[PDB]
Amino acid sequence: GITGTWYNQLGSTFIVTAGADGALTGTYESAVGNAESRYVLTGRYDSAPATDGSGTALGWTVAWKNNYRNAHSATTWSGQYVGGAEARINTQWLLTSGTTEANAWKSTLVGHDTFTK
Amino acid sequence: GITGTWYNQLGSTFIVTAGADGALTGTYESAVGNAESRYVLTGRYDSAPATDGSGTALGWTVAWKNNYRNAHSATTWSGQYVGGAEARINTQWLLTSGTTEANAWKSTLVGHDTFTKV
Amino acid sequence: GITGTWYNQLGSTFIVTAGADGALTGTYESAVGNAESRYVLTGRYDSAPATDGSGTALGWTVAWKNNYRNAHSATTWSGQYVGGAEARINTQWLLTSGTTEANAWKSTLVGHDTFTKV
Amino acid sequence: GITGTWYNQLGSTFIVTAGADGALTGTYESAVGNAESRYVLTGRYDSAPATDGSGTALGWTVAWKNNYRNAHSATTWSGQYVGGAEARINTQWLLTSGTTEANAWKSTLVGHDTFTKVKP
Ligand SMILES: O=C(CCCC[C@@H]1SC[C@@H]2NC(=O)N[C@@H]21)N[C@H]1CCNC1
Ligand SMILES: O=C(CCCC[C@@H]1SC[C@@H]2NC(=O)N[C@@H]21)N[C@H]1CCNC1
Ligand SMILES: O=C(CCCC[C@@H]1SC[C@@H]2NC(=O)N[C@@H]21)N[C@H]1CCNC1
Ligand SMILES: O=C(CCCC[C@@H]1SC[C@@H]2NC(=O)N[C@@H]21)N[C@H]1CCNC1
């Protein structure tokens, strides 16, 4: 289902395991921005979704610090997994940078990523 | 720092531990919405933030399923921690509900929560 | 290049005139939500872009009140026009509802619409 | 209620007239960013709001081009006009900059501005 290796429209790689506890754990590697190699991710998903054809709600976070690079920023992806032959995770995301109070107004980027296996 | 009990403008309770590894673990209790009692949260923060009077970038997720209730939804908060006399976690959030294809355009609420120590 | 009829992925119809002064005027007809028939839109665009190699930044508003229906809400679309063979208006939107204080946390939906000429 | 001079938490000045036609027209001056002096705005508001205590939905745009400067960007504010302790407009906004399609992931800032009629 959710567990596996996903790619988005940028060619970023999202490697995730969906725990029985409703946890998401894995690694993110962004094709773009102030990022190199893998970053830890953690998140949550609805481990008992509706059976009415509705998607499975989920979210995860990456802080853009690893052993190579610190971009003083975090992204959260909020979305739903859509099952089937052509499984999809459809997300919107918020990317917050650590800023001074003067620059807080421009701290947060927003966008949308769709993942496929 | 980040570890401890935070309150937002809705009166919601955010209980978090900030691990040396950059992990956030804890519970969330929403004063509003399709929610009761505490929910598991997990997240990440910049464990080596800039020391320039910049905020500390962080985010976390709550899937709105616990032993009482399932709201078939998930919120992510993305924001920054500011220390000092007036400690704040300033966030914007995305709440996505599980929807049919037809209803996906209205799947996602957006808002902002400001968390304080008192 | 902006002036004319545009269609998004929901099948909504966006009819706009881009004035030489940076104005956007026209009508919006939503294929979804609490809406029927056309609604007035107004907005603004960058009428002096630096390069065709960057999108043309623009935005517009619909208040969801016309002679038929009032959905006590307003959408803003913020995005960029991309010209040429496969012309597109790539947007993110915020749909705010008039809410009681109690419901204000859930006042705003967010999404993304891609407009094409076909 | 909406017609007047407003200021947000950054000290930006929002000057707006709410027309009989549901139109918003006026000027915006940002305290921050790649902006100097006034910019045109246009938008729309709900001219027949609910009578149940609900706020009044509205939205406006500014393209960041005037006679001084061009930041090749536009902001939309989506929000509601309310009462409370005083007259308020609560908004969330999207600020889109001209980018390549490939770099659109970094095109759009998002935030929230609260306006009152108090000079900062
Ligand atoms: O550039 C960064 C860190 C890298 C962010 C990459 C983003 S996450 C959302 C989108 N999807 C994806 O797959 N890649 C992109 N942070 C910057 C922000 C401003 N200063 C640090
Ligand atoms: O209503 C829910 C579940 C509860 C969401 C509470 C939200 S998270 C963002 C904000 N901050 C806070 O402290 N509380 C609120 N899920 C669905 C049901 C229908 N609407 C969303
Ligand atoms: O449902 C409404 C009014 C109609 C909104 C339609 C939205 S605008 C964004 C998206 N793109 C498009 O083409 N159509 C849709 N207002 C309601 C919604 C929740 N309460 C107020
Ligand atoms: O910097 C700019 C143009 C100015 C934007 C000011 C923003 S609108 C939202 C917020 N509220 C307010 O009152 N002021 C700020 N454009 C830049 C963005 C990236 N490159 C062009």
Author numbering:
A (entry chain AAA): 16 to 132
B (entry chain BBB), C (entry chain DDD): 16 to 133
D (entry chain CCC): 16 to 135
From the paper:
Tetrameric streptavidin (T-Sav) has been popularly used, engineered and evolved for hosting reactions that are mediated by biotin-appended chemical catalysts. We have recently reported an organocatalytic 1,4 conjugate addition of nitromethane to cinnamaldehydes within a protein environment through adaptation of the streptavidin–biotin technology. In this system, biotin was covalently modified with pyrrolidine groups, resulting in ligands 1 and 2 which differ by one stereocenter. Here, we performed mechanistic investigations on how a protein host affects iminium catalysis.
In each T-Sav, there are four biotin-binding sites whose arrangement locates the catalyzed reactions at the interface of two subunits which has a C2 symmetry. In previous and current crystallographic studies, Ser112 was found to be in a hydrogen-bonding distance with the reacting nitrogen atom of the pyrrolidine motif. Altogether, this suggests that Ser112 helps in positioning the intermediate for nucleophilic addition at the Cβ position, improving both the regio- and enantioselectivities of the reaction. In contrast, the conversion and stereoselectivity were mildly improved when the T-rSav-L124W variant was used as a host, indicating the importance of placing a bulky and hydrophobic residue at this position (entry 23). The Lys121 residues in both T-Sav subunits (namely SavA and SavB, see below) are also in close proximity to the reacting centers. In contrast, substituting Lys121 with methionine or arginine does not affect the performance of the reaction, implying that the size of the sidechain, rather than its electrostatic properties, is responsible for the observed selectivity (entries 25 and 26). Notably, the Lys121 variants resulted in low 1,2-byproduct formation, indicating that this residue does not improve the regioselectivity of the reaction but plays a role in guiding how the nucleophile (deprotonated nitromethane) approaches the C-4 of the iminium intermediate. The non-linear increase in yield implied that each T-Sav binding site cannot mediate iminium catalysis simultaneously and the intersubunit interface can only host one chemical transformation event at a time. Our mutational, crystallographic and mechanistic studies have indicated that the protein environment corresponding to the subunit interface of T-Sav is critical for catalysis by biotinylated secondary amines. This microenvironment controls the reaction conversion, regioselectivity (1,4- over 1,2-addition) and stereoselectivity (S vs. R).
